[PDB]
């Protein structure tokens, strides 16, 4: 079933900040904001962890769209291959979630990678979830239109943070 990261890195503070730093041409800004909040609350509502949205500076969870190299030693690679990636909880790049601007992203109303599912998967990583062996799990390693966290996803996050 679920994986965490080696040594179970987790947020140590009651409150974790997150910033949507950069946006996609594919969607309105507010749509990315509301889908990220939704992706975070899907994990959030299961655990004793609270997210505060910040609109400037460095937050614990830096979220954005990037083309190619974007300062974290894991450059994006243009259309296809890598779609997105994220870092386990930690200082600096820890917690950060990046989306490759050279794919196509949708809110579900158009063609594209479903951004809500993608953001739920990457922010799983941001909170300390590894890849699940369970195909139903959002944290399954391969890529959505109508979904929720699986019982494996809930089990894993609650094992790392506790319930409620």
């Amino acid at each position: 079933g679920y994986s965490l990261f080696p040594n179970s890195p987790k947020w140590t503070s009651k409150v974790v900040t997150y910033r949507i730093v950069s946006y996609t041409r594919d969607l309105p800004h507010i749509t990315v904001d509301r889908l990220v909040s939704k992706a975070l609350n899907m994990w959030g509502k299961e655990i004793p962890l609270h997210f505060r949205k910040v609109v400037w500076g460095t937050a614990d969870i830096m979220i954005g769209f990037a083309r190619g190299a974007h300062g974290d030693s894991y450059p994006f690679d243009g259309p296809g291959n890598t779609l997105a990636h994220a870092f386990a909880p930690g200082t600096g790049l820890g917690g950060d979630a990046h989306f490759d601007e050279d794919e196509r992203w949708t809110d579900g109303s158009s063609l594209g990678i479903n951004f809500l599912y993608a953001a739920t998967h990457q922010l799983g990583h941001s909170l300390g979830m590894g890849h699940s062996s369970d195909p139903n799990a959002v944290m399954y390693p391969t890529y959505p239109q109508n979904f929720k966290l699986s019982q494996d996803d809930i089990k894993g996050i609650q094992k790392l943070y506790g319930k409620r």
């Binding site: 990261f5 080696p6 890195p9 894991y74 890598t82 779609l83 997105a84 990636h85 994220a86 870092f87 386990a88 930690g90 990583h125 979830m129 590894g130 890849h131």
Partner: peptide, 4 residues
């Protein structure tokens, strides 16, 4: 992709 999950990195450290």
């Amino acid at each position: 992709x999950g990195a450290v």
